[PDB]
Amino acid sequence: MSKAQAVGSNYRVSLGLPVGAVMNSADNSGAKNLYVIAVKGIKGRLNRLPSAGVGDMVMATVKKGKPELRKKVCTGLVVRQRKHWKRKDGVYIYFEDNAGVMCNPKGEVKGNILGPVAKECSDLWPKVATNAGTIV
Amino acid sequence: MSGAGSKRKNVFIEKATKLFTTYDKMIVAEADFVGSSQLQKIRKSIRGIGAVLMGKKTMIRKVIRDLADSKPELDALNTYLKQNTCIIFCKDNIAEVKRVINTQRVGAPAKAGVFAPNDVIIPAGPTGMEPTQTSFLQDLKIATKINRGQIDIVNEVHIIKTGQKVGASEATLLQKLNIKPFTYGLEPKIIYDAGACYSPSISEE
Amino acid sequence: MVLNSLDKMIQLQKNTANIRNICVLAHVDHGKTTLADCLISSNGIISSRLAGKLRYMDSREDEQIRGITMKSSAISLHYATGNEEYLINLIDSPGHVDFSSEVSTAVRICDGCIIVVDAVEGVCPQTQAVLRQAWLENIRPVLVINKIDRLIVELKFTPQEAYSHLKNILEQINALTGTLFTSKVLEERAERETESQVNPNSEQGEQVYDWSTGLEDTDDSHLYFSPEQGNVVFTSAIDGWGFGIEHFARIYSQKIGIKKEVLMKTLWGDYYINMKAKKIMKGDQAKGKKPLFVQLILENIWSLYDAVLKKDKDKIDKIVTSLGLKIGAREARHSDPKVQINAICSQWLPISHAVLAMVCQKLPSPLDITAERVERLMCTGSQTFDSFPPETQALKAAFMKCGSEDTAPVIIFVSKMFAVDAKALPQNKPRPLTQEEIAQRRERARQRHAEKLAAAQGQAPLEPTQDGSAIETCPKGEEPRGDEQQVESMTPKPVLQEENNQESFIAFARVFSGVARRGKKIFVLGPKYSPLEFLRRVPLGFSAPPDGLPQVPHMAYCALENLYLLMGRELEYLEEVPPGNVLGIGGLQDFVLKSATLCSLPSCPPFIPLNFEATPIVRVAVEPKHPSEMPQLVKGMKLLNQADPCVQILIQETGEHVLVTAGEVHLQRCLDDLKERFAKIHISVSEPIIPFRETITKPPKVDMVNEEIGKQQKVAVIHQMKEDQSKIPEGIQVDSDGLITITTPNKLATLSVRAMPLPEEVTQILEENSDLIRSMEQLTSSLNEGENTHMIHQKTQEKIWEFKGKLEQHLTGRRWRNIVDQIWSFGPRKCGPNILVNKSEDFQNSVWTGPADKASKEASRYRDLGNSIVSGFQLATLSGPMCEEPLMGVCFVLEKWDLSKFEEQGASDLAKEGQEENETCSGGNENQELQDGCSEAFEKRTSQKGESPLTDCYGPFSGQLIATMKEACRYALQVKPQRLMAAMYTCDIMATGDVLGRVYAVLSKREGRVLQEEMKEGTDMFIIKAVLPVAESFGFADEIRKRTSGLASPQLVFSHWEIIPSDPFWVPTTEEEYLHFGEKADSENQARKYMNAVRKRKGLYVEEKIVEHAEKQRTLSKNK
Amino acid sequence: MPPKVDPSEKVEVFLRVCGGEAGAMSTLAPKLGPLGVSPKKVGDDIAKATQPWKGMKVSVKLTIQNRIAVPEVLPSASALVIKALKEPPRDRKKEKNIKHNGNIPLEEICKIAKTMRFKSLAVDFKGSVLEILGTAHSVGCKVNGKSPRDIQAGIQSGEIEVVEPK
Amino acid sequence: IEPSLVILARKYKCDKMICRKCYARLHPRAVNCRKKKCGHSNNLRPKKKLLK
Amino acid sequence: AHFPINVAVTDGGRVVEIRNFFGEKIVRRIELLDGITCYRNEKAKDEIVLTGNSLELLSQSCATIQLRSAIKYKDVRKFLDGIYVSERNVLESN
RNA sequence: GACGGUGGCCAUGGAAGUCGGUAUCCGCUAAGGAGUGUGUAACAACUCACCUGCCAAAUGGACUAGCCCUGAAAAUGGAUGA
């Protein structure tokens, strides 16, 4: 799932961390944390984490949030990777700290996206682009 | 097939070796190119004058039947079996035997398909065809240029040239006018009269 | 029109008889895109098709190709053209694909509808279901033919094929016409011709000059083979088209000078102009020349397409010029191949100039056609109508001028409500209350506020771009946001969304009402209003308020501040509707109840009762999940009532957790609804449905029942009935070959019964249930019956003046009129087929007079033993020959029941009984201050004298007695011969020559037989009659469709139930009888499982008690 | 000819199963059914009136299509005559139920009626026609002399010869 | 035409005989699988026919 | 005719190419063997003829062409479409 | 060429050789089962059984056992010893 990239996949993979990394929910829904289970499309090989997306969809969970949203897996969307990258451009976007949002399995983000969102992510997921006034 | 043509001899030696050519007169006519439907009906006039006889495998054992009968086998140097034919027994006169089946000669519906003469007129088949269809069919003599929802083709005559006799006629064009000329078959190959063979004639002498 | 406002429309909407209701409709929403596309462009309050396609309307090419994609929506499409108003409104009724009540409901939300009929297939369950209602109503529906630019663009044919297509359409429609009505003369009109203008003075006079030729209606005033005064159309939408015959005519007119009417006639069928100088010579009217469409009009279109394909800039322009219209602006602005076409078909598209006139010509007023649509659907009922004398107070004068009153009282009519907890836009807030502000918003929230919205959205959290000219400019709806407001307005606020919280009072519906204003009162009616109920389906007519006549007496009023369909949503501005309209109830009302028509009158004869069933009785006894949400389901079913006409919520016959539907998938849909769009719970479904009737074939043999039909000596009727059960629980004592009695006390209190067949007509009426519950119980307290006594007799023949049993009556002399009083348990539901036979005044304190059922007849006293009888034999009628289910298709007989039996048979069982009760023998006459024996004597009037010396207070105790009656009866049934009387709907399937065999095959596969065929007079269509069971008739239409292409149209009429060969058994509940071992296939069939999860049904009765009672679990059976 | 108005128009002979009234004829034949403009109910009158106690099940019924101008001629077959001979109530109202209750001869009372009806067919008449008649139906059994559905060139039920007028 | 061409089409594809081993479409009046691996089986379904 | 099959040619070079074929937007060029000509009295966008001298080669070429106008995925009773040899072993009248 | 009584009787608007079932008989013929299939709503049409034309002398089945093939896949490269 979902899947819709992009055109392209907005080029190479970069992560803040793979499996077992907290990033904030950045969402009006009362998920307060997002912890990764795994990432979609990772086919992977012998001993290698299923590694965080640059703006791609993930199997996640609400570890600390609303108890209703707590437990039960959730497809999400990575929004900003603390750990850095170069783009086809020659810039190195880098962030304060990791972040994403909990989302629908057609990609759609629920409420409104908080804070700054890398443009690649927006490009990937049109709903994301729609539901924010910050796309930097 | 698998047999003596199709099956063993002991069915067609029963109405061949038993039923001879032993009669007043005979005429050898081609009438196996016509359907049994109307042939069996016009067999009513044939069974009065005699009957039809023999399967055509025993045509070379007909010599031992012409020793018994007074008439010979080869009168005009023919065994009288070269195509699909019959032998009509006859007791009519020399001139009237030549018109005993020609007065009632007629074709019939076929099982493996046969031609019809396109010199004579083709009867009217399906009537009230589509206007577009009619327009398309330019080979029809009286054609239209699209008229209303429905229109007659208007054809009670031949739709193709006069000249093509039976054998080399267009059967594909007789499907356009479904009812086709039934005026073929039941014709004499030779006119035999017990030791006096005349040529095949449609009319009396 | 690009510019229209609601300020102009509200004034012109008040007046009536010059408005003309028009509606959009199709068989499965086929040709919906085309109709809508052309209308959107026309409409001005949405600002053309540039800022169009808002307020729910999803256009698709799939649909055109052939596709349903059904949806419930509405666009506010009013027109302030010239000097008049035009209440069109884009009605999109979803309907349903199979025949049903749903189809009847949804489709009836239309006045003066245009109907798209036959997509590329006819004579289906689709077309004969939805449009079955529309063509029945004489509302002057116009013939809309399918897309013609498919033949030009997609398939790529010449315009000559258009004619062919038209012809085909006509042919298709002929079949449809011949389902109802008659279509022997109309097969001539299912062609393409114009036989007029063959004369020399016409061929060069009215073809050069104008003159005039008639285009008026002929024979039929429906959609079958008529021009409808120049409103027939060829509706397309690939780049948007809005055109038809009129358009074609117009072009022709422009070439030399011929009248439009004349031209239209020519263009309906074929006409042959030679084109020398537009003058014709005869000879070409019997042979032909060249039809019109390929000569001119569509030829031009074809040429244009060709030009486009090749890519020519001036050629296209030339073609356009030739076609008799202006060439437009975008010819050297863009490269313009399709763009040019698009440009032209925004200038060309506003049909309001042409079509409105045509509409007017067709339809002088909506007042006229309203009189012809009352007698075509339910208004009094299925029997009578309001147009006839039954139910006539002030209706005939009212619906001639339309509406109930000219001052607007409001009414109701079901057309399926909107889904709550999603849309909840009707509110009690200032901006909908203020009717002007909302109107203003509506006219400004198409492409004007959109820019503002955009500005708000992108530039509020600050910095979307990084080092760009977005934050630098900071737009307030100026130069940047002006773009992207012509192809589609980005974020325009289409339906005026919810600013404040949800308060759901949404409803779809229809109402015809006069001039309604804001702050208008209506007298709200209760959850069950009796007066209303009493008015419908009978000749009664009266208007009075509650004086204790309804269940709830009330003197309260409800407000009604608006009339809305939710087409522009919220409390609208356009509320001043004329007599006759497409809108439903508004204000704070979503009550479209069955027994509560919202009116200003406190009670009135209901104008439309709820819709009728296509196939009678489709049910399922489901149960919900999790404990607190049990009444939730019930609550939901109150909302379900509002939506669909039939659900078992009002009046308990089978209990409130049961659906009532007509259809194949309708039931399924209903099931899904109460998980989704009503109550948000989740429930246990059970797709096995409809328990069949259990009929006993014949009586039992000589055992303890001497009055009988001789012998039951058969091996098996279909499955064995002798060795499968019985003969050892209470058969070791008596009966060798079976068991028709009991020996628990062992001849202290015993009985014997019989189950004969009963004639089928009689059964049918019984099972309809004409008798009431009060007709069989408590006649001393309530009123003593009279009209009901003879009716019963007419059905089941038995009386208190019959001392030779049931046998005499069943055989000889049917339909007598006598009193059938003093009956305990007349059937399983107390209104059914069974009866307990009185063949005695008094045996020995048994079998005479009910608990309080009387005919004013007594031998000595009314007192007898009615308490132990009535409860016992109710349970005997509810456990069949395989346990469970009601005895249906049966007239029960009681040979004898004898209490106070001083005889007895020496055995172990007897001994045990003796030990238990310490009785030397049974009685009632005597006592030792021991045991029980309850009777009717004690509660009615104390002691019993005359019929017996002492009252019954002795013999086996009452509970035990009650138990034992059930047991013996159960035993008797089990041993009797029985067959499965399967439930049936006869299939009167409209079929054609090629698809009879296929239909028959299906029937063969799924049980039944073809009885006979009836042929329609003068057509290739027929109607085949064939019985088919009810269980297999579900998913039938779909199957039919799959088999060929839906060329046969099914419709399931109810034709009683029949006996067919299937194994009528199910494993016995008693484990002593399961030692015989009923087989897993033949004594537990898949057809015979309608009981484990298909029998939880009780408004009236479904009680099954645990048999045998004898003190405690240690003292029940010790020597036994 | 084309179906456009009701007859007289489609003037042509058609063989029909018209004869019965509750199985063998509910509404018209399968050839005249799928056609255009023509009254499909007037075909009920030719069987109900002309054949009230004659052969019901798949009768040999010729009727010229002029519609309310038909001869109601009855050419018949060997299985119709037997039916006719048998009483009314066992023939009709028994068309979804089998019947084998005929023991009436066609070798004496129907013997001479064979040639009067059929006088122009493939078969020979007088000598030949007597044998076909003697076995062309399963309902009737006949007396000893001839019997159906066994050889007619050897033993029959008394007759051994190829032809002998019983 | 379309009937005269559909038949032709069928003849080239749908109306041949498959094996019950190799499933190999032989020819409309076939009698052996004509393969080495099969062993010319002499067991032959006619390939199915359908209206859809 | 849903996606009308459109075949074109060059003679001399002796090649046939199939443009539209079951919505295939490619060309399927197939070089005919030497000694094969191709004319076409089409009736309703149907019929190609290929005439040649060596039976063995012309026939082969035809077969190849036929093969090329075929789909390798999904049912064969689905699409009953492609090129199909109506009349082989046909000899012109001289 | 492959007919008639004939739409035999059943079931069945209808299913006529052929949804399906039964009895399965005779006329005329060289020749034709109340019929092998395809097909038809069903009839028809075609095809078979069955008969003749032509070519012109061999042919058809059913097994039997010799070699060959199918069956017959496993792990470092590979062994009639090469």
mmCIF file of C-alpha atoms (C1' of nucleotides) in Angstrom, chain B residues 1 6-7 11-12 15 32 34-37 40 43 52-57 81-82 84-85 110-114, chain G residues 1-5 17 27-32 35 37 45-56 59-60:
data_model
loop_
_atom_site.group_PDB
_atom_site.id
_atom_site.type_symbol
_atom_site.label_atom_id
_atom_site.label_comp_id
_atom_site.label_asym_id
_atom_site.label_seq_id
_atom_site.Cartn_x
_atom_site.Cartn_y
_atom_site.Cartn_z
ATOM 1 C CA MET B 1 -17.031 -46.034 -44.693
ATOM 2 C CA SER B 6 -19.877 -48.629 -46.859
ATOM 3 C CA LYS B 7 -21.265 -51.947 -45.446
ATOM 4 C CA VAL B 11 -27.753 -56.120 -47.814
ATOM 5 C CA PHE B 12 -27.354 -54.831 -51.440
ATOM 6 C CA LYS B 15 -32.369 -56.117 -53.826
ATOM 7 C CA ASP B 32 -29.514 -39.474 -58.282
ATOM 8 C CA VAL B 34 -32.127 -34.937 -57.148
ATOM 9 C CA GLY B 35 -33.600 -35.212 -53.646
ATOM 10 C CA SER B 36 -35.683 -38.201 -52.532
ATOM 11 C CA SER B 37 -38.484 -35.854 -51.330
ATOM 12 C CA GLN B 40 -40.537 -40.574 -54.102
ATOM 13 C CA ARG B 43 -42.216 -42.499 -58.270
ATOM 14 C CA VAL B 52 -36.592 -48.806 -60.269
ATOM 15 C CA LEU B 53 -34.066 -51.658 -59.851
ATOM 16 C CA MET B 54 -30.563 -52.799 -58.773
ATOM 17 C CA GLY B 55 -27.554 -51.273 -57.005
ATOM 18 C CA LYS B 56 -24.949 -50.274 -59.606
ATOM 19 C CA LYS B 57 -22.174 -52.627 -58.361
ATOM 20 C CA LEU B 81 -23.245 -47.366 -65.947
ATOM 21 C CA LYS B 82 -20.732 -44.489 -66.075
ATOM 22 C CA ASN B 84 -24.751 -41.926 -60.838
ATOM 23 C CA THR B 85 -27.837 -43.285 -62.640
ATOM 24 C CA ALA B 110 -30.794 -31.456 -51.568
ATOM 25 C CA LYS B 111 -28.726 -32.859 -48.664
ATOM 26 C CA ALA B 112 -25.153 -32.249 -49.970
ATOM 27 C CA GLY B 113 -26.070 -29.334 -52.313
ATOM 28 C CA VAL B 114 -26.492 -29.212 -56.121
ATOM 29 C "C1'" G G 1 -28.268 -38.969 -52.539
ATOM 30 C "C1'" A G 2 -29.205 -39.610 -47.026
ATOM 31 C "C1'" C G 3 -37.437 -39.963 -48.126
ATOM 32 C "C1'" G G 4 -42.502 -40.737 -46.207
ATOM 33 C "C1'" G G 5 -46.705 -42.288 -42.495
ATOM 34 C "C1'" G G 17 -34.179 -37.972 -34.376
ATOM 35 C "C1'" G G 27 -43.897 -48.144 -46.607
ATOM 36 C "C1'" C G 28 -40.733 -47.018 -51.001
ATOM 37 C "C1'" U G 29 -35.829 -47.717 -52.563
ATOM 38 C "C1'" A G 30 -29.321 -49.233 -54.489
ATOM 39 C "C1'" A G 31 -30.473 -45.827 -50.069
ATOM 40 C "C1'" G G 32 -31.746 -44.062 -45.309
ATOM 41 C "C1'" G G 35 -31.351 -41.517 -35.496
ATOM 42 C "C1'" G G 37 -22.952 -35.566 -33.223
ATOM 43 C "C1'" A G 45 -29.327 -26.666 -41.803
ATOM 44 C "C1'" C G 46 -25.111 -29.543 -41.723
ATOM 45 C "C1'" U G 47 -22.618 -34.194 -40.211
ATOM 46 C "C1'" C G 48 -23.027 -39.556 -39.178
ATOM 47 C "C1'" A G 49 -25.136 -44.456 -39.789
ATOM 48 C "C1'" C G 50 -26.823 -46.013 -44.721
ATOM 49 C "C1'" C G 51 -26.483 -46.156 -50.238
ATOM 50 C "C1'" U G 52 -24.190 -45.066 -55.337
ATOM 51 C "C1'" G G 53 -20.086 -41.995 -58.689
ATOM 52 C "C1'" C G 54 -14.963 -41.787 -59.653
ATOM 53 C "C1'" C G 55 -9.784 -43.407 -58.657
ATOM 54 C "C1'" A G 56 -8.061 -48.437 -59.202
ATOM 55 C "C1'" U G 59 -7.644 -53.171 -46.775
ATOM 56 C "C1'" G G 60 -9.653 -53.328 -41.123
#
